[PDB]
UniProtKB/Swiss-Prot annotation, chain A:
Binding site for ATP: D257, E258, M259, G260, L261, G262, K263, T264
Written domain comment of the UniProt record: The 2 chromodomains are involved in the binding to the histone H3 methyllysine at position 4 (H3K4me3).
Boundaries of every Helicase C-terminal domain copy: 555-710
Positions spanned in the full protein: 122 to 956 of 1468
Key words of the record: ATP-binding, Chromatin regulator, DNA-binding, Hydrolase, Isopeptide bond, Nucleotide-binding, Nucleus, Phosphoprotein, Repeat, Transcription, Transcription regulation, Ubl conjugation
Residue ranges constituting the Chromo domain according to the UniProt record: 51-113, 141-206
Protein's name according to its UniProt entry: Chromo domain-containing protein 1
Principal location: nucleus
Disruption phenotype: Decreased sensitivity to the cytotoxic effects of 6-azauracil.
UniProtKB/Swiss-Prot annotation, chain B:
Keywords from the UniProt entry: Acetylation, Chromosome, DNA-binding, Glycoprotein, Isopeptide bond, Nucleosome core, Nucleus, Phosphoprotein, Ubl conjugation
Entire-sequence positions represented here: 34 to 125 of 126
PTM comment: Monoubiquitination of Lys-88 by BRE1 gives a specific tag for epigenetic transcriptional activation and is also prerequisite for histone H3 'Lys-4' and 'Lys-79' methylation. GlcNAcylation at Ser-80 promotes monoubiquitination of Lys-88. It fluctuates in response to extracellular glucose, and associates with transcribed genes.
Role summary: Core component of nucleosome. Nucleosomes wrap and compact DNA into chromatin, limiting DNA accessibility to the cellular machineries which require DNA as a template. Histones thereby play a central role in transcription regulation, DNA repair, DNA replication and chromosomal stability. DNA accessibility is regulated via a complex set of post-translational modifications of histones, also called histone code, and nucleosome remodeling.
Residue positions with a glycan: S80
Protein family per UniProt: Belongs to the histone H2B family.
Organism: Xenopus laevis
Record location of the Glycyl lysine isopeptide (Lys-Gly) (interchain with G-Cter in ubiquitin) cross-link: K88
Protein name: Histone H2B 1.1
Lineage: Eukaryota, Metazoa, Chordata, Craniata, Vertebrata
Principal location listed in the UniProt entry: nucleus
Subcellular location: Nucleus; Chromosome
GO cellular component terms, semicolon-separated: nucleosome; nucleus
UniProtKB/Swiss-Prot annotation, chain D:
Modified residues (N6,N6,N6-trimethyllysine): K6
Modified residues (Phosphoserine): S33
The protein, known as: Histone H4
Species this protein is from: Xenopus laevis
Glycyl lysine isopeptide (Lys-Gly) (interchain with G-Cter in ubiquitin), cross-linked positions: K77
C-alpha cells in the first residue's frame, strides 16, 4: 500500500502524461456518390458519325467526346452501372480513376493496335485477358446469396421490401441493399432459397444430444435420398459407410484417398448424412486452402443445396458483415446466441486471425482439408485448431506420411490426443525382428482409422507412369566449381570479375547449385564465354555455353529434340526459380514456345498460362514449374512427359509434380525422366527420398483401407532394401506382383554424352540462327 | 544460473512502489544500468588507488569516485546513503 | 476530388506529435537486415547474425538519426528557416566532431 | 535475359523516403528538403560501417563467424554510445 521508501532529493514535480489532444489544431482540421470502377468503353459516343478519321491517335480531349464509359459508382450494386460521358459526369469524386482508365486502356490499346512490331501471339493474348476481365466484370451482376430482408421507407414511398444481396465473385463488403422486385425477376431461385433458409427445418438448436449413445449404423448399399447432387460412385459410397461407421463408434479419421477420387464429394455427402439422418445439424467447420475453396463452394451448392453453408473469407468489414448478419438467429440480443448456419467454410489464415471469434463456438464437426499442413505439432495452426471445442474431428489428405513417423504421430495426436504413442523413429540399420513387430503394431493400430484408396484400384483405365532415373556426369566447369566449394577456396572463387562476395554459408545449397548449372553463380557466364567462345557472345556461342556448362543440359537438349521430333509435350520441374530463368533463357535463344509458372507469377496469369497450355490449338511445347507452387489444383492434362530437373527432399512433392500430368482420364502413357548429377550431393538427396518412399510403402501402403505369414518375410525384404544403397534406346517414351512393382523406378540408368563443343547447333540450326542474326541488323530495332 | 540483478531491483521497486510491476525489457535495462554504474565507480576508484600508489580500494576511494561521477544532489545523497550504510555495518 | 484541403504544416505537426509519443522502430526490419548484411560482407565473408544483434543495431541507428535530426533542426532554426537542408546536417556533424 | 545476379546493391535504398521522414518527425522536423534523403543514407551508412567493423573485430577475436548482440553492444560502448536493453 503505502511505500516504505521515499526520496530526499528536492526535485520539482513533473507531469509524465504524454497523451496529446489535437483539439487546438481543429482550426485547420475540420473548422457519397462518385466514380468507383470504370469497366468498359464504347467507340460511339451518341451516334455513328461516320467511318472517316479512322487513322492517327486520339488525345485526352479527343476521347472526352468520342467514348462513353461504363461506370460502377460508389456504394452501388453493379446493376446500376451507367454508360456516361465526361460532360455527362460533371465533377464527382473518382474522376482521376476515369482519367487513368482512359489513358491506360485507350493509349496502350491503340499503341498495340497501331504498332507494326506486334505479333499474332501478343494480340491474341491481349484479347484473351481483355475478354477475361470484361466477363469477370460481367459476373458481378448475378446474385449469389440473399443475406437479410428489411422494410425500408423511401421519400414518400410507404414501405418497401429491401433485400441484402451478395454477388458472385464479390464479397460481403460488397453486399448491397436492393429492391425485392428486380431481385425476384432476376434470379428467383436464390430468393426461394432465402425463404427456405428463413423457416428452415434444420437448425443447430434442433440438434440431437447423443452423449456416447449414438445409434448403430447399417450399411448403405444405395445412395441416400437427401444427397441429391449427381450420382455417388461405389467407392465413394464405401467411403460414406466407413465415415459413418467410424462416427458411430465415436472415433475420428483420416480420409487418405489419392487426388482425383472426389474427397470433397465424400465429405459433403457425409455432412449431409450427419445433418439429415442423425440430426446432428449443428455448427460444422471445414478448414480448406484458399485456392480449392471455390471447388468446395460449388460442391456444397450442387450436392447439398438445402444446407446453410456460409463462406468466411475477406477483410475485416466483410468478416464483420458475416459475423453480425449471418452467424446468429438472434444477433441483436446479448445473452445466449444460438447459431444460424450449418456449415462454415474457412481458411487457415482466418483460423489464425479469428481464433478468438471462432474458438468460442461449440462445433459439432471439424473437417480439415490438406491435413499435411497440420503435419507439424509446433505450428501456430496446430495450436489454434487443437484448442477448438469440437466433438468430432476429421483430416482429409492424400499424403498422411511425408518425411518421418513424427508427422503421422502429430496427425493421430490431433485426431486422438493420448491413445496413440510413438517414441521410436524407424532406423534402416538394425533390421531386427523388434522393428518389424513395431511396424506391424503400428499397422494394426491405425488400420481402422485411415481409409486410403489408390487411383489404380478404382477407375481401371488409367495408363501407367514410368519413372526413369538418369545419372549424368559433370562438366569441367561443374567439376572445378564442386572442387572449389567442397575444399573451400574463397581466393579461387573470388577470382574472376572481382568476385561479388561469394557466400559459402549453406555449403549443400552451393553444391546443389553447382550440380545444377555453373551459371547460378555470379560472374560465371563471363569466364565460360571468354574461355571458349572468346568473349564475343555473338548469339550462337551463348547457347553453346548454356548447353555445355552443365552436364544436365546436354541430356536436356537431347531429350527436347527427341520429344519435339515425336508428338509429345513436356513439363519441367525445378526446385529453384533461378534455374527456371536459366531454362527460360535457353528456350528463348533456342526458340521454343514455352510457358512458365512459379511463385512470382500471380494467379490470374497462372490461370491464363494453364488455360493456354491446355487449349487444343496450343503451340506451346514445354511448361516449366517450380515444384512446390500452385497447390494441388493445377490441371496439366495435355502434357505427356515430366522432367524432374531437381529432386526434392520430400518425395511427396515429386509425386504431386508427377501427378500434375498423371491425372484421372489421361489419354497417354506418362513418362518421367529424373535428371541426376553423378557423384554429387544429389546422390544422398535421392537416397533420403528412397528411404522416405520405403517408409511410406511400409506404414501407409501396407495398412490401406495367409499373407500374414509372408508379411514377416516381405517386411524384412523391404527393410533390407531400405538398408541398401541404390547407387551400386535410353530416352524411349514407351514401356511394354505389387512388391516387385516397387522395386522398379529405383534403378539408375547412367547416361554418357561425350559431346564436344562443335557438335551442337547443327547445320539446320546454325543456318537459322545466322540468318536471323543477319536479318536483325537489316531491320535494326 | 544467469547471475543477474533482477531480484534486488524488484525488492527496491516494492520498497518504492509496492503495487507497481515491471516488464522484462525494463528489468534488463535496470540490470544494464546497475552494471554500468558499478563498472564506472569501480574503474574510477581503481584509477584513484593507482594515482595515490595504494594497493587497496577502501570506502574512501568509492566515496571519491561517487563525488567524481555523480552530479549535484545525487552525489551528496549517495554519499550520505553509503556513509550511513558503512556506519550501520561497522556497528553490528 | 474532395473539398476541405488541409494547410501545409499542420499535418506535419500532427506527425511530429504522433511519432514523438510512440516508441516503435520507424524503419522496416527486412531492408535494415539487408543493409547490415551488405555492409558486413565487406569486412568479413560468411558472417552469421543473431536477430538481437540486428535489433540492437537498428535501435542504435534510429537513436543516432533522431538525435542528428534534432541537431539539424536546431541548425535550420538558427539560420531563420524551417526546412532542413544538407548543410544543416553538415554543420551539426562538424560541431559534433564527426566531420572535424 | 531472365537470368541476373543474386546479389543486390541498392540496399541503402531500402531506407526509404517515408522512413527518413518518420525519423525526422521523431526529431521534431517540420519541413524537409529533397536532398536530405541521400545525405541521411550516407550518414547512416558511415555510422553503420563504423559500428559493424568494431563488432566484426570483436567477433573474430572470439574465433566466431556469428555476430552476437553482445559484440554490437561492446562496439557501440567503445565509441561512446552505450545501449541498454541488450546487455542482460
Amino acid at each position: 500500500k503505502i511505500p516504505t521508501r521515499f526520496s530526499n532529493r528536492q526535485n520539482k514535480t513533473v507531469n509524465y502524461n504524454i497523451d496529446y489532444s489535437d483539439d487546438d489544431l481543429l482550426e485547420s482540421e475540420d473548422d457519397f456518390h462518385g466514380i468507383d470502377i470504370v469497366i468498359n468503353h464504347r467507340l460511339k459516343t451518341s451516334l455513328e458519325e461516320g467511318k472517316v478519321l479512322e487513322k492517327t491517335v486520339p488525345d485526352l480531349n479527343n476521347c472526352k467526346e468520342n467514348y462513353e464509359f461504363l461506370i460502377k459508382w460508389t456504394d452501388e450494386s453493379h446493376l446500376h452501372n451507367t454508360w456516361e460521358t465526361y460532360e455527362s459526369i460533371g465533377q464527382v469524386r473518382g474522376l482521376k480513376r476515369l482519367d487513368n482508365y482512359c489513358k491506360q486502356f485507350i493509349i496502350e490499346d491503340q499503341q498495340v493496335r497501331l504498332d507494326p512490331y506486334v505479333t499474332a501471339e501478343d494480340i491474341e493474348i491481349m484479347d484473351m485477358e481483355r475478354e477475361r476481365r470484361l466477363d469477370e466484370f460481367e459476373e458481378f451482376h448475378v446474385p449469389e446469396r440473399i443475406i437479410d430482408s428489411q422494410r425500408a421507407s423511401l421519400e414518400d414511398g410507404t414501405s418497401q421490401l429491401q433485400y441484402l444481396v451478395k454477388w458472385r465473385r464479390l464479397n460481403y463488403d460488397e453486399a448491397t441493399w436492393e429492391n425485392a422486385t428486380d431481385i425476384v425477376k432476376l434470379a428467383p431461385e436464390q430468393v426461394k432459397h432465402f425463404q427456405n433458409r428463413e423457416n428452415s427445418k434444420i437448425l443447430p438448436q434442433y440438434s440431437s444430444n447423443y452423449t456416447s449413445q449414438r445409434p448403430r449404423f447399417e450399411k448403405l448399399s444405395v445412395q441416400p435420398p437427401f444427397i441429391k447432387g449427381g450420382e455417388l460412385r461405389d467407392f465413394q459410397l464405401t467411403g460414406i459407410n466407413w465415415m459413418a461407421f467410424l462416427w458411430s463408434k465415436g472415433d475420428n479419421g483420416i480420409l487418405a484417398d489419392e487426388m482425383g477420387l472426389g474427397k470433397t464429394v465424400q465429405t459433403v455427402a457425409f455432412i449431409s448424412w450427419l445433418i439429415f439422418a442423425r440430426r446432428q445439424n449443428g455448427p460444422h467447420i471445414i478448414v480448406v486452402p484458399l485456392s480449392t475453396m471455390p471447388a468446395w463452394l460449388d460442391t456444397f451448392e450442387k450436392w447439398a443445396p438445402d444446407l446453410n453453408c456460409i463462406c468466411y473469407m475477406g477483410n475485416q468489414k466483410s468478416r464483420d458483415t458475416i459475423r453480425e448478419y449471418e452467424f446468429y438467429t438472434n444477433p441483436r440480443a446479448k445473452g445466449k446466441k444460438t447459431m444460424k448456419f450449418n456449415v462454415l467454410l474457412t481458411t487457415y489464415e482466418y483460423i489464425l486471425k479469428d481464433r478468438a471469434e471462432l474458438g468460442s463456438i461449440k462445433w459439432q464437426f471439424m473437417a480439415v482439408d490438406e491435413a499435411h499442413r497440420l503435419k507439424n505439432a509446433e505450428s501456430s495452426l496446430y495450436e489454434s485448431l487443437n484448442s477448438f471445442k469440437v466433438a468430432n474431428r476429421m483430416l482429409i489428405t492424400g499424403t498422411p506420411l511425408q518425411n518421418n513417423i513424427k508427422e503421422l504421430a502429430a496427425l493421430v495426436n490431433f485426431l486422438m490426443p493420448g491413445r496413440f504413442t510413438i517414441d521410436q523413429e524407424i532406423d534402416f540399420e538394425n533390421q531386427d525382428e523388434e522393428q518389424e513387430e513395431y511396424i506391424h503394431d503400428l499397422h494394426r493400430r491405425i488400420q481402422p482409422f485411415i481409409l486410403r484408396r489408390l487411383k489404380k484400384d478404382v477407375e481401371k483405365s488409367l495408363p501407367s507412369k514410368t519413372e526413369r532415373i538418369l545419372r549424368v556426369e559433370l562438366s569441367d566447369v561443374q567439376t572445378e566449381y564442386y572442387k572449389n566449394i567442397l575444399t573451400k577456396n574463397y581466393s579461387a572463387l573470388t577470382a574472376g570479375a572481382k568476385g561479388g562476395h561469394f557466400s559459402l554459408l549453406n555449403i549443400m545449397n552451393e553444391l546443389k547449385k553447382a550440380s545444377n548449372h555453373p551459371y547460378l553463380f555470379d560472374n560465371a557466364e563471363e569466364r565460360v564465354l571468354q574461355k571458349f567462345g572468346d568473349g564475343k557472345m555473338t548469339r550462337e556461342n551463348v547457347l553453346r555455353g548454356l548447353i555445355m556448362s552443365s552436364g544436365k543440359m546436354v541430356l536436356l537438349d537431347q531429350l527436347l529434340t527427341r520429344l519435339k521430333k515425336d508428338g509429345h509435350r513436356v513439363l519441367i520441374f525445378s526446385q529453384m526459380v533461378r534455374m527456371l530463368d536459366i531454362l527460360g533463357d535457353y528456350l528463348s535463344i533456342k526458340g521454343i514456345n514455352f510457358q512458365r509458372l512459379d511463385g512470382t507469377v500471380p494467379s490470374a496469369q497462372r490461370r491464363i498460362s494453364i488455360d493456354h497450355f491446355n487449349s487444343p490449338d496450343s503451340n506451346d511445347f514445354v511448361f516449366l514449374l517450380s515444384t512446390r507452387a500452385g497447390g494441388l489444383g493445377i490441371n496439366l492434362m495435355t502434357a505427356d512427359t515430366v522432367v524432374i530437373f531437381d529432386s526434392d527432399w520430400n518425395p511427396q512433392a515429386d509425386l504431386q509434380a508427377m501427378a500434375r500430368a498423371h491425372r484421372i482420364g489421361q489419354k497417354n502413357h506418362v513418362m518421367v525422366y529424373r535428371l541426376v548429377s553423378k557423384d554429387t550431393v544429389e546422390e544422398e538427396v535421392l537416397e533420403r527420398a528412397r528411404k522416405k518412399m520405403i517408409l511410406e510403402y511400409a506404414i501407409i501402403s501396407l495398412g490401406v483401407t495367409k499373407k500374414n505369414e509372408p508379411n514377416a518375410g516381405e517386411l524384412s525384404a523391404i527393410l533390407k532394401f531400405g538398408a541398401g544403397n541404390m547407387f551400386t534406346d535410353v530416352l524411349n517414351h514407351a514401356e511394354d506382383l505389387g512388391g516387385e512393382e516397387f522395386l522398379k523406378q529405383f534403378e539408375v540408368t547412367d547416361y554418357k554424352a561425350d559431346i564436344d563443343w562443335d557438335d551442337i547447333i547443327p547445320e539446320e540450326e546454325l543456318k537459322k540462327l545466322q540468318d536471323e542474326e543477319q536479318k536483325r541488323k537489316d531491320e535494326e530495332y | 544460473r544467469k547471475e543477474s540483478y533482477a531480484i534486488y531491483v524488484y525488492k527496491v521497486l516494492k520498497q518504492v512502489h509496492p503495487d507497481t510491476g515491471i516488464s522484462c525489457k525494463a528489468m534488463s535495462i535496470m540490470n544494464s544500468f546497475v552494471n554500468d554504474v558499478f563498472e564506472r565507480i569501480a574503474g574510477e576508484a581503481s584509477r584513484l588507488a593507482h594515482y595515490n600508489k595504494r594497493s587497496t580500494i577502501t570506502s574512501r576511494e568509492i566515496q571519491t569516485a561517487v563525488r567524481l561521477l555523480l552530479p549535484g544532489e545525487l552525489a551528496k545523497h549517495a554519499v550520505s546513503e553509503g556513509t550511513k550504510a558503512v556506519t550501520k555495518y561497522t556497528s553490528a | 476530388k474532395k473539398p476541405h484541403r488541409y494547410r501545409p504544416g499542420t499535418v506535419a505537426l500532427r506527425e511530429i506529435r504522433r511519432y514523438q509519443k510512440s516508441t516503435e522502430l520507424l524503419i522496416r526490419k527486412l531492408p535494415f537486415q539487408r543493409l547490415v548484411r551488405e555492409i558486413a560482407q565487406d569486412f568479413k565473408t560468411d558472417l552469421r547474425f543473431q536477430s538481437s544483434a540486428v535489433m540492437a543495431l537498428q535501435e542504435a541507428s534510429e537513436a543516432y538519426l533522431v538525435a542528428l535530426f534534432e541537431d539539424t533542426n536546431l541548425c535550420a532554426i538558427h539560420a531563420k528557416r524551417v526546412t532542413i537542408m544538407p548543410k544543416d546536417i553538415q554543420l551539426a556533424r562538424r560541431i559534433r566532431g564527426e566531420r572535424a | 535475359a531472365k537470368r541476373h545476379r543474386k546479389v543486390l546493391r541498392d540496399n541503402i535504398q531500402g531506407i526509404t523516403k517515408p522512413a527518413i521522414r518518420r525519423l525526422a518527425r521523431r526529431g521534431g522536423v517540420k519541413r524537409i528538403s529533397g536532398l536530405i534523403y541521400e545525405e541521411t543514407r550516407g550518414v547512416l551508412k558511415v555510422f553503420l560501417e563504423n559500428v559493424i567493423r568494431d563488432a566484426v573485430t570483436y567477433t573474430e577475436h572470439a574465433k566466431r563467424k556469428t555476430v552476437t548482440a553482445m559484440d554490437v553492444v561492446y562496439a557501440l560502448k567503445r565509441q561512446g554510445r552505450t545501449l541498454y536493453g541488450f546487455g542482460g
